[PDB]
Amino acid sequence: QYHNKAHLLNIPSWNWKEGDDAICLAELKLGFIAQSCLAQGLSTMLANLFSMRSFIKIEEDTWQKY
Amino acid sequence: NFQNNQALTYWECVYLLMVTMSTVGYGDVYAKTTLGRLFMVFFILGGLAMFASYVPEIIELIGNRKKYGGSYSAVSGRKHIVVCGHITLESVSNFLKDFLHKDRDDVNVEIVFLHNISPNLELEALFKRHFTQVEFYQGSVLNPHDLARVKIESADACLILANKYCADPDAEDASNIMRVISIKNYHPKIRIITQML
Amino acid sequence: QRMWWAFLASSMVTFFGGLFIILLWRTLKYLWTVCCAEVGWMTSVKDWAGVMISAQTLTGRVLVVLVFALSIGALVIYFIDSSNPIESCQNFYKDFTLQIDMAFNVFFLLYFGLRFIAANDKLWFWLEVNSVVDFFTVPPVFVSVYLNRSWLGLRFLRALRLIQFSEILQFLNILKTSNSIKLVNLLSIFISTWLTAAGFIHLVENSGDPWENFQNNQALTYWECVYLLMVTMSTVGYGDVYAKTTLGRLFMVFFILGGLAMFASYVPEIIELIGNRK
Amino acid sequence: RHCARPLSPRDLAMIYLLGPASFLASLVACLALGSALTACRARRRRRQ
Amino acid sequence: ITTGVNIPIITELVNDTNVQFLDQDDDDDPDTELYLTQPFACGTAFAVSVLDS
Amino acid sequence: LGFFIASDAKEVKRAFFYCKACHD
Ligand SMILES: CC(C)CCC[C@@H](C)[C@H]1CC[C@H]2[C@@H]3CC=C4C[C@@H](O)CC[C@]4(C)[C@H]3CC[C@]12C
Ligand SMILES: CC(C)CCC[C@@H](C)[C@H]1CC[C@H]2[C@@H]3CC=C4C[C@@H](O)CC[C@]4(C)[C@H]3CC[C@]12C
Ligand SMILES: CC(C)CCC[C@@H](C)[C@H]1CC[C@H]2[C@@H]3CC=C4C[C@@H](O)CC[C@]4(C)[C@H]3CC[C@]12C
Ligand SMILES: CC(C)CCC[C@@H](C)[C@H]1CC[C@H]2[C@@H]3CC=C4C[C@@H](O)CC[C@]4(C)[C@H]3CC[C@]12C
Ligand SMILES: CC(C)CCC[C@@H](C)[C@H]1CC[C@H]2[C@@H]3CC=C4C[C@@H](O)CC[C@]4(C)[C@H]3CC[C@]12C
Numbered sequence: 001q002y003h004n005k006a007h008l009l010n011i012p013s014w015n016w017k018e019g020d021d022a023i024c025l026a027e028l029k030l031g032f033i034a035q036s037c038l039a040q041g042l043s044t045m046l047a048n049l050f051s052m053r054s055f056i057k058i059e060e061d062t063w064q065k066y
Numbered sequence: 067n068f069q070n071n072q073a074l075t076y077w078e079c080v081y082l083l084m085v086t087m088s089t090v091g092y093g094d095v096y097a098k099t100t101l102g103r104l105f106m107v108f109f110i111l112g113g114l115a116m117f118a119s120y121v122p123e124i125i126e127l128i129g130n131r132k133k134y135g136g137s138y139s140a141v142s143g144r145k146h147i148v149v150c151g152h153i154t155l156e157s158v159s160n161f162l163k164d165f166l167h168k169d170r171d172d173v174n175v176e177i178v179f180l181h182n183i184s185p186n187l188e189l190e191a192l193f194k195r196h197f198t199q200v201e202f203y204q205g206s207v208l209n210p211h212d213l214a215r216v217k218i219e220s221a222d223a224c225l226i227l228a229n230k231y232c233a234d235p236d237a238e239d240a241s242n243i244m245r246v247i248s249i250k251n252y253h254p255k256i257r258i259i260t261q262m263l
Numbered sequence: 264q265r266m267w268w269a270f271l272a273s274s275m276v277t278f279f280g281g282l283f284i285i286l287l288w289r290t291l292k293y294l295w296t297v298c299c300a301e302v303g304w305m306t307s308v309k310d311w312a313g314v315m316i317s318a319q320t321l322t323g324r325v326l327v328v329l330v331f332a333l334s335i336g337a338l339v340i341y342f343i344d345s346s347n348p349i350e351s352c353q354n355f356y357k358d359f360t361l362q363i364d365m366a367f368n369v370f371f372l373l374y375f376g377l378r379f380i381a382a383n384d385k386l387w388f389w390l391e392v393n394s395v396v397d398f399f400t401v402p403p404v405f406v407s408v409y410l411n412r413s414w415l416g417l418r419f420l421r422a423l424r425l426i427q428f429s430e431i432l433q434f435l436n437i438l439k440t441s442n443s444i445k446l447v448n449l450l451s452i453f454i455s456t457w458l459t460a461a462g463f464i465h466l467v468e469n470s471g472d473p474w475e476n477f478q479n480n481q482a483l484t485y486w487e488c489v490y491l492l493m494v495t496m497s498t499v500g501y502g503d504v505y506a507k508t509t510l511g512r513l514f515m516v517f518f519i520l521g522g523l524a525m526f527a528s529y530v531p532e533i534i535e536l537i538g539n540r541k
Numbered sequence: 542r543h544c545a546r547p548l549s550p551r552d553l554a555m556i557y558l559l560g561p562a563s564f565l566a567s568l569v570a571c572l573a574l575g576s577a578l579t580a581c582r583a584r585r586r587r588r589q
Numbered sequence: 590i591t592t593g594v595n596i597p598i599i600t601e602l603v604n605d606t607n608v609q610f611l612d613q614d615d616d617d618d619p620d621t622e623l624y625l626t627q628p629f630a631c632g633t634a635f636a637v638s639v640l641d642s
Numbered sequence: 643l644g645f646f647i648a649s650d651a652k653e654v655k656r657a658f659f660y661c662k663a664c665h666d
């Protein structure tokens with residue numbers, strides 16, 4: 001949650017410059033939903049970029065191949 | 067001076083420790099040397115505990131498996147229906163009594179139950195009584211593989227039963243709603259007869 | 264002068280030829296696939312056989328009761344014949360027991376045919392305990408009747424037929440309560456395992472080790488072997504009677520695990536099921 | 542041991558094939574009985 | 590007559606396996622991963638699990 | 643420092659090894 005995320009910003013040792021990264025699942029998911037609202041299909045495009053995927057080929061010509 | 071030696075083969079010793087470790091005891095073969103008896107004293111504690119705590123566990127691990135994990139085999143010229151939902155002894159007995167009554171025509175319609183919970187002894191006996199008319203399979207409606215096992219694509223209809231005596235009617239209604247959702251997701255053209263509280 | 268491989272191998276090749284033919288049909292279907300509203304007469308006959316073996320009609324109930332009675336009778340006949348020597352000569356024209364045994368075995372063969380017809384899957388039916396018992400029971404006596412010589416063989420496997428008894432009591436609508444079904448199941452399994460293991464021990468101890476020219480034989484009666492496996496399976500142990508042959512000791516090694524677990528997990532349950540009541 | 546005698550080739554063939562022959566005969570007899578009973582039931586059903 | 594399957598909709602699902610119920614014109618498979626599913630590939634389904642990367 | 647989209651890091655490694663003279 002974002003309100004619980006704001007608590008971490010009050011810690012003296014919590015420094016954003018050093019790399020203290022509080023990935024907010026609700027915040028990022030809502031941002032992805034809004035970006036999909038701007039342009040449909042962008043959420044999956046962004047999600048697949050962060051995910052490490054191999055190089056797989058399919059014999060038959062289907063949508064899954066492309 | 068090695069004068070206490072006993073002519074024991076390896077198989078005889080294996081049999082001896084089988085007899086000892088199970089606390090059976092025979093006295094036909096036993097350790098006679100001092101070192102053999104000291105090792106028997108230690109192995110009594112060790113191997114007896116290991117046998118007692120291991121053999122039932124190994125037997126229960128090997129024995130357990132799916133019992134109704136097969137797939138229904140459709141027969142040409144005969145139709146079948148699939149029954150899911152609230153599957154208990156009382157509901158199944160009532161459904162079979164009101165479905166296979168002699169007052170109807172000579173209808174050859176097989177009944178295939180799909181339930182995620184294994185039946186108890188009474189339900190198994192009831193299924194045995196209707197040996198040629200009723201078949202049972204274990205699986206979840208929300209699982210497409212279980213729906214494919216009972217050959218729902220060729221089923222004449224799908225019947226869903228509800229627990230009318232649930233503490234929370236909303237929860238049971240919702241569970242039936244997602245059972246309907248799953249069966250329609252697998253095959254949308256299948257006929258659904260379901261109870262709504 | 265010893266003729267036990269004949270009776271062994273008649274049933275042995277029966278079971279093997281059955282499995283071989285089944286796998287051959289399956290492989291033929293497989294190769295054929297790879298390289299290339301009225302029900303049928305087969306379906307109607309299968310439904311008829313299933314209805315009959317499930318005691319859904321008067322004839323089915325009579326057949327099931329006869330199966331129960333004749334299983335008990337075959338077990339009693341084996342008990343009577345256990346006192347006879349391991350290998351002896353038979354006449355078939357003066358002994359009534361042999362004729363009764365043949366009638367029982369013919370009935371069991373017909374029942375096996377009905378069960379095979381009613382079976383959904385033939386491969387898994389072929390590996391059923393009852394099917395194996397029939398395989399190793401009927402061809403032995405069939406060969407014995409012409410060979411005029413009788414070998415004790417694997418008749419103890421007849422006791423395994425008792426395992427079916429509970430199911431029989433469920434086909435006749437006699438067993439309906441869960442407690443009664445559980446009690447009958449436990450009693451049948453326990454008694455059948457005990458008697459079959461006792462018969463196996465009796466056979467291996469009286470015949471002796473085949474590779475030692477049968478010089479390891481021990482004069483053990485069937486009752487003595489039953490008492491021995493009672494003593495062993497309860498982990499009591501006496502040493503007054505024990506298996507001396509290699510086959511007997513191997514079977515004792517396996518039965519220790521099996522029967523000890525079965526006794527420990529069954530006897531208290533049977534006692535608590537019988538004892539409880541209003 | 543009066544039954545002891547040389548094992549003729551017919552004895553070998555019968556010993557190796559009596560089990561399968563008996564089981565095949567049982568299957569054939571049960572198939573014939575089932576066919577006859579089903580035909581009789583169908584005849585009694587249709588004629589009414 | 591404009592049916593509702595053409596309306597752009599994105600659905601937040603906590604359980605990935607439920608993604609099979611979102612669309613009826615695809616071959617559902619429980620073993621298929623969420624990213625391989627058609628409703629996710631079309632931008633109509635989103636789950637926080639894909640954020641674990 | 644540039645951000646690329648590519649199948650593997652060895653593919654993007656070619657960007658730092660690109661030579662104008664060698665690919666004139
Ligand atoms: C289900 C589990 C517990 C089965 C265990 C199998 C047991 C019974 C087997 C596995 C290994 C076997 C041993 C392997 C080798 C030998 C040495 C040989 O000279 C005599 C037989 C003997 C001594 C065997 C006896 C039986 C044995 C102990
Ligand atoms: C000499 C004696 C003890 C040998 C006994 C061998 C037995 C146990 C073996 C030999 C061949 C085996 C069969 C070979 C092939 C298959 C097909 C498979 O899908 C299920 C098991 C099944 C049906 C096996 C069951 C066990 C089997 C029958
Ligand atoms: C249903 C299950 C339990 C059946 C398993 C088959 C068992 C009981 C059969 C298959 C092979 C058989 C053995 C094969 C060979 C011989 C040698 C003979 O001189 C004495 C009997 C003996 C030692 C047999 C005893 C019984 C036996 C072990
Ligand atoms: C060794 C002795 C006990 C054998 C006597 C015969 C057998 C079949 C005995 C042992 C177990 C008994 C069964 C135990 C329990 C029940 C359930 C009851 O609702 C009907 C009778 C029935 C089914 C019994 C029938 C007779 C039965 C007495
Ligand atoms: C409550 C339950 C466990 C009771 C079980 C009954 C037991 C004790 C009975 C049932 C069957 C009986 C056996 C049946 C037949 C024989 C063969 C005969 O030549 C000697 C007695 C002997 C070996 C019997 C011994 C006792 C026996 C095993």
Ligand SMILES: [Ca+2]
Pocket residue numbers: 251608609610611612613614615616617
């Ligand atoms: Ca779908």
Ligand SMILES: [Mg+2]
Pocket residue numbers: 197198199200201
């Ligand atoms: Mg059926």
